[PDB]
Amino acid sequence: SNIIRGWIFGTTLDSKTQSLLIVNNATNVVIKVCEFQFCNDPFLGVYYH
Amino acid sequence: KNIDGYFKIYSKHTPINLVRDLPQGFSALEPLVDLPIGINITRFQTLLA
Amino acid sequence: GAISSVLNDILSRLDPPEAEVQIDRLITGRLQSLQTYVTQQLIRAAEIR
Amino acid sequence: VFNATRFASVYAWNRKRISNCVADYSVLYNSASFSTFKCYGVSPTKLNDLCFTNVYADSFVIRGDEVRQIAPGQTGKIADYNYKLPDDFTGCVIAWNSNNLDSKVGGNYNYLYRLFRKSNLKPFERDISTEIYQAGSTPCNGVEGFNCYFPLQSYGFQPTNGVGYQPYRVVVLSFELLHAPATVCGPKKSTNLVKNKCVNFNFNGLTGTGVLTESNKKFLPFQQFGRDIADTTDAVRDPQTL
Amino acid sequence: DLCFTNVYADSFVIRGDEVRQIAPGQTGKIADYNYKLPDDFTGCVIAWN
Amino acid sequence: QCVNLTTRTQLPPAYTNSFTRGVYYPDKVFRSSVLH
């Protein structure tokens, strides 16, 4: 069901370091290297079927 | 893997028929892209839907 | 001990000032291989004779 | 890349992917300023004969005293701390002077550098972290103080300083070579393809003597060169037509 | 201690950025175009301001 | 973003065997009927 969406590759998983974020938002394969505000539980949900 | 600041990814997709524990088989993984991320990766997570 | 095993790579990469450092490593590696092989043949020919 | 307006700093340096173009270094000789020019893994006379797969330009501005630090196997505040080159670095280093543009009368504080780093990071790595370095035993808690120094300082960029203190621009080229399909190849005109005759072939810079025949081998789309037991190139792929 | 047979002086004036180009196996507007040194060049290069 | 899930059940990290997984092409080079 395409549940694996991507990863977050970082050092400390925080804004104190530079991290990789490879995801897929069902349109484009998004690969970004930014200073991310890391959430404790990243997810992408589908709603109200 | 991230060695010498050169993130190598290797992708392989094949159809399977599986309920349970990882199948006894073989598949040669092929490189898709090459990402010059230039970071340090020690910890990571995985997105789910 | 050289940067590569192929003679055609060093002829396509390095100058003859920098290739004689590298090709003479290939020549010595191939001559010692032949001096290995002729040693293995003469001892074997002494066994057959 | 070489004639841009403003470069980036050394801790965060722009890495523009050079793909699908003609590597002609004779265009740069109209306005040439190249002070040092060293290719460690390759030779500069083969730049027109040999061509490269994935050319990456490493553009940043540092102090003129630390240009020799950009080398595989050196240290410094540039080499050991933020911009490290690999041990197997097969590439070229192109650097030149920038007194006429990057020197300000008052001072150019926009070009920062990393002076305090905790450990020895991996080569080809960028570091945009602005965390306060802990030089002592007390926790810094993200503020400055005793043994708590801000890691990003700036050089003195004035045209009246010493020439070793003057900012030198630098662009370093890195590539994978003779294993991958080549996208960037320079202004050497290709010739006709001759089959069933012993010729002197040149495929993506790889020169040698061989016979070109058709085959039933089907290469993968990421594969260019076919090799043998003896490790020599047994088959290539035509980059123009499939 | 060693002395030489046919010493030839190569006297000219170029830009200060291109002095390292005078070497066996380099390029430039001086090395590649008009003043080229041989691959088997056994000699000395003396330059000054 | 900051809101975490509440249906997470603490379960022990069990172990799994792999048969022959983890093999990739080390470079971009074609090879035919060889053992490299």
UniProtKB/Swiss-Prot annotation, chain D:
Effect of Q153R: In strain: Omicron/BA.1, Omicron/BA.2, Omicron/BA.2.12.1
Region (Receptor-binding motif) location: 97-168
Phenotypic consequence of F116L: In strain: Omicron/EG.5.1
Effect of Y113F: Decreased HLA binding to NF9 epitope. Increased binding affinity to human ACE2
Phenotype when changing N161Y: In strain: Alpha/B.1.1.7, Beta/B.1.351, Gamma/P.1, Theta/P.3, Mu/B.1.621, 19B/501Y, Omicron/BA.1, Omicron/BA.2, Omicron/BA.2.12.1, Omicron/BA.2.75, Omicron/BA.4, Omicron/BA.5, Omicron/BQ.1.1, Omicron/XBB.1.5, Omicron/EG.5.1; May enhance affinity to human ACE2 receptor
Cystines in this chain: C39-C92, C51-C185, C140-C148
Result after altering S35F: In strain: Omicron/BA.1, Omicron/BA.2, Omicron/BA.2.12.1, Omicron/BA.2.75, Omicron/BA.4, Omicron/BA.5, Omicron/BQ.1.1, Omicron/XBB.1.5, Omicron/EG.5.1
Region of interest (Receptor-binding domain (RBD)), ranges: 1-201
Effect upon mutating Y165H: In strain: Omicron/BA.1, Omicron/BA.2, Omicron/BA.2.12.1, Omicron/BA.2.75, Omicron/BA.4, Omicron/BA.5, Omicron/BQ.1.1, Omicron/XBB.1.5, Omicron/EG.5.1
Effect of Y113F: In strain: B.1.1.298
Effect recorded for N100K: In strain: Omicron/BA.1, Omicron/BA.2, Omicron/BA.2.12.1, Omicron/BA.2.75, Omicron/BA.4, Omicron/BA.5, Omicron/BQ.1.1, Omicron/XBB.1.5, Omicron/EG.5.1
Residue span(s) of domain BetaCoV S1-CTD: 1-187
Phenotype when changing R6T: In strain: Omicron/BQ.1.1, Omicron/XBB.1.5, Omicron/EG.5.1
Subunit annotation: Binds to host ACE2. RBD also interacts with the N-linked glycan on 'Asn-90' of ACE2. Cleavage of S generates a polybasic C-terminal sequence on S1 that binds to host Neuropilin-1 (NRP1) and Neuropilin-2 (NRP2) receptors. Interacts with host integrin alpha-5/beta-1 (ITGA5:ITGB1) and with ACE2 in complex with integrin alpha-5/beta-1 (ITGA5:ITGB1). May interact via cytoplasmic c-terminus with M protein. May interact (via N-terminus) with host bilirubin and biliverdin, thereby preventing antibody binding to the SARS-CoV-2 spike NTD via an allosteric mechanism.
Described function: Attaches the virion to the cell membrane by interacting with host receptor, initiating the infection. The major receptor is host ACE2. When S2/S2' has been cleaved, binding to the receptor triggers direct fusion at the cell membrane. When S2/S2' has not been cleaved, binding to the receptor results in internalization of the virus by endocytosis using host TFRC and GRM2 and leading to fusion of the virion membrane with the host endosomal membrane. Alternatively, may use NRP1/NRP2 and integrin as entry receptors.
The name this protein goes by in its record: Spike protein S1
UniProt organism field: Severe acute respiratory syndrome coronavirus 2
Gene: S
First-to-last residue of the parent protein present: 341 to 582 of 1273
